[PDB]
Amino acid sequence: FQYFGSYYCQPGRDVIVHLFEWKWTDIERECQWLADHNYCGVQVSPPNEHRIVTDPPYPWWQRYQPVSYTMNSRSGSETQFRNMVTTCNNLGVYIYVDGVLNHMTGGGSGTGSDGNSFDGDSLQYPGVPYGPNDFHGSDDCSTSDGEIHDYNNPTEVRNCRLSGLRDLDGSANYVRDVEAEFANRLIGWGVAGFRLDACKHMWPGDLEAILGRLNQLNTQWFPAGRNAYIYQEVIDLGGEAVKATEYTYLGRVTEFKHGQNLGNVVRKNNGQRLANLVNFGEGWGQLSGFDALVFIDNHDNQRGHGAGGFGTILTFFEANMYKIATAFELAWDYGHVRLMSSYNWPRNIVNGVDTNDWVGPPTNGGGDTKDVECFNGEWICEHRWREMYNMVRFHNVAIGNPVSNWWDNGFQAIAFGRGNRGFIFINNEDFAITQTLQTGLPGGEYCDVISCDNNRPPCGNSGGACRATVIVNGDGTATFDVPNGENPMIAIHVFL
């Protein structure tokens, strides 16, 4: 039995970023910035040939309808993909492919992003090739429309069609061989791993058979005898017949409870309290940290498609709370952390649903994607926000230390350290707090890395609101003056 939940990073790097709908040429350039800020890797949008949808015009979700396993996509050509992987790998920033193996397209016919035909009505995908024998059908699914409705029926969830997406027969030797060939081709070029889409809709045994066909990582960059990193998108918020714990033996699993819980806590939904995070992690009924890929939001649930709709998940639209939740997640020790990196779109919530949730990335038209320019009102670039990247540095400095010196106000203020390496005071109250705490840190002069550029004087005021220096006393205590409001947190850490 091979296990795929271990990932590989350069020393001092750990956090990964989803550069959602970024072009390969932009990711290739971004790898320098990411390396300089000690991020470990990038999840890239599905790079295989996908459906081109023109009604509505070029939505993001067309990339979740495979047409073939060639490598010309909205983000760029095979040549551009391979240039990106090579450059990023040489910089020590690795690439995880969003791998879409559960299904092909929905109904209708057309061509994909590399010119190959699809026909979801006849189940013909000549670019693979797949035909009807390669799919589940009326022999395998008994619902009246062929779609999934009863999430208490694992057979229905796995063998019927997710919203009409034609469902591949993952038990078939041919499908397993074809999908492994796709993954192995990408591994051979230098891809480090995969985010596997829609895994709740596949049988773990079929995933095991596909993963057993995989070659090990390319030793131009990776250690000999290393399996690819696999993290599996399994949406499991409890009370269903498919469980995230079915997939952890194969690799890591997305823990959607993490962002649900942190979102509810930071929003103070239904009387939640920041102080309740004292035991956050597996003890909240979540996966063990070692089995989990964690994140505040993803591309689906920032569009209201997760549970609670728009009322729980935090996103760049709620920037102040989003930074609080992300800072906590990065300072804590639980899971492999992925940060979303988003684009803006005309979100328009009507009766709880965003009417414009289909809108694709910044475009001049014609299905192209604009070059990224961070902070221009179109590309959000959360991973480049100082509050994020300085908390990634905090996370890196703190690595391997326990949570220590926990404090809270019984309510909406907590503070904790990571050994003798870092300390964060989070005041989520509607009033200011002055509090002296054992920070666990060596005595000295520290800067708040939430508001300042550097961890020690000179503090650096590029953001314009760098707070006064924090003095840690000789006994390890420090006095935190934390006003409520924007960025209502102070994080300090020893020199990297």
Q: Binding partner of residue 315 among Cl ion, Ca ion, none, CB under 5 to 8 Å per kind?
A: none
Instruction: Determine if 167 is a binding residue for Ca ion (CB under 5 A).
Output: yes
Considering only 298, 326, 396, 451, the residue that binds Cl ion (CB under 5 A) is 298
Does the annotation list 102 as a binding residue? yes
Whether 161 has a binding-site annotation, put simply, is: no
Q: Is 493 annotated as a binding residue?
A: no
Active-site residue 179, yes or no?
no
Q: How far is the CB of 254 from Cl ion (least distance, A)?
A: 5
Binding flags for Ca ion, 260-289, as an x/- string (CB under 5 A): ------------------------------
- Could you say which of Ca ion, Cl ion, none residue 439 binds, taking C-beta under 5 to 8 angstroms by partner kind? none
- Residue 367 · residue 50 · CB < 8 Å: no
Active site residue 147: no
Q: Where are the alpha helices (DSSP H) in 352-433?
A: 386-398
Round to whole Å and give the CA distance between 91 and 35.
Answer: 6
Closest separation in Å from C-beta 233 to Cl ion: 4
Report yes or no: 118 and 111 within 8 Å, Cβ to Cβ.
yes
Could you say whether residue 233 binds Cl ion (CB under 5 A)?
yes
Nearer to Ca ion among residue 118 and residue 389 (C-beta) = 118
User: Which of 49, 233, 329, 357 is labelled catalytic?
Assistant: 233
Of 23, 74, 176, 201, which one interacts with Ca ion (CB under 5 A)?
201
Least distance (Å) between residue 199 CB and Ca ion: 9
Binders in 57-116 for Ca ion, by CB under 5 A: 102
Least distance in angstroms from the C-beta of 110 to Ca ion: 22
Would the annotation count 386 as a binding residue? no
Residue 37, Cα to own-chain centre: how many angstroms?
18
Judged by phi (left if over 0) then psi (alpha if -120 to 50, else beta), residue 420 lies in: alpha
Considering CB distances under 5 to 8 angstroms, the limit depending on partner class, which of Ca ion, Cl ion, none binds residue 323?
none
Q: How many residues bind Cl ion (CB under 5 A)?
A: 3
**Strand arrangement of the beta sheet that strand 477-482 belongs to:** 433-438, 477-482, 470-472, 444-446
Identity of the residue, 340 or 459, whose beta carbon is nearer to Cl ion in the bound complex: 340
Give strand pairing partners of 444.
472
Does 382 engage in binding with Ca ion (CB under 5 A)? no
163 within 8 A of 66, measured Cβ to Cβ:
no
CB 298 → Cl ion: shortest distance, Å? 4
Torsion of CA 351, 269, 258, 416, to 10 degrees: 150
The least CB distance from residue 59 to Cl ion, in Å, is: 18
**Interface with Ca ion, residue 176, by CB under 5 A:** no
Burial of 26 (0-12, 13-18, 19+ CB in 10 A): buried
Q: How far apart are CA 38 and CA 6, in angstroms?
A: 19
Other CB atoms within 10 A of residue 219 CB = 10
Cβ-in-10-Å burial (0-12, 13-18, 19+) of 352 comes to: exposed
Alpha-carbon distance of 248 to 292, in angstroms, equals 8
Peptide bond into 442 cis (omega under 30): no
Q: Name the active-site residue from 197, 246, 291, 357.
A: 197
Instruction: Name beta bridge partners: 44.
Output: 97
Report the alpha-carbon distance of residue 149 to residue 152 in Å, rounded.
9
Stretch that binds Ca ion, among 157-165, 219-227, 286-294, 307-315 (CB under 5 A): 157-165
Partner interacting with residue 201 (select from Cl ion, Ca ion, none; CB below 5-8 Å by kind): Ca ion
Indicate which of Ca ion, Cl ion, none lies near residue 298 (CB less than 5 to 8 Å, by partner kind). Cl ion
* Integer Cα distance of 197 and 232 in angstroms: 7
Which residues carry out catalysis? 197, 233
Give residues in contact with Ca ion (CB under 5 A).
102, 158, 167, 201
Residue ranges of the annotated binding site for Ca(2+) are 102, 158, 167, 201
Give residues in contact with Cl ion (CB under 5 A).
233, 254, 298
Residue ranges of the annotated binding site are 102, 158, 167, 201
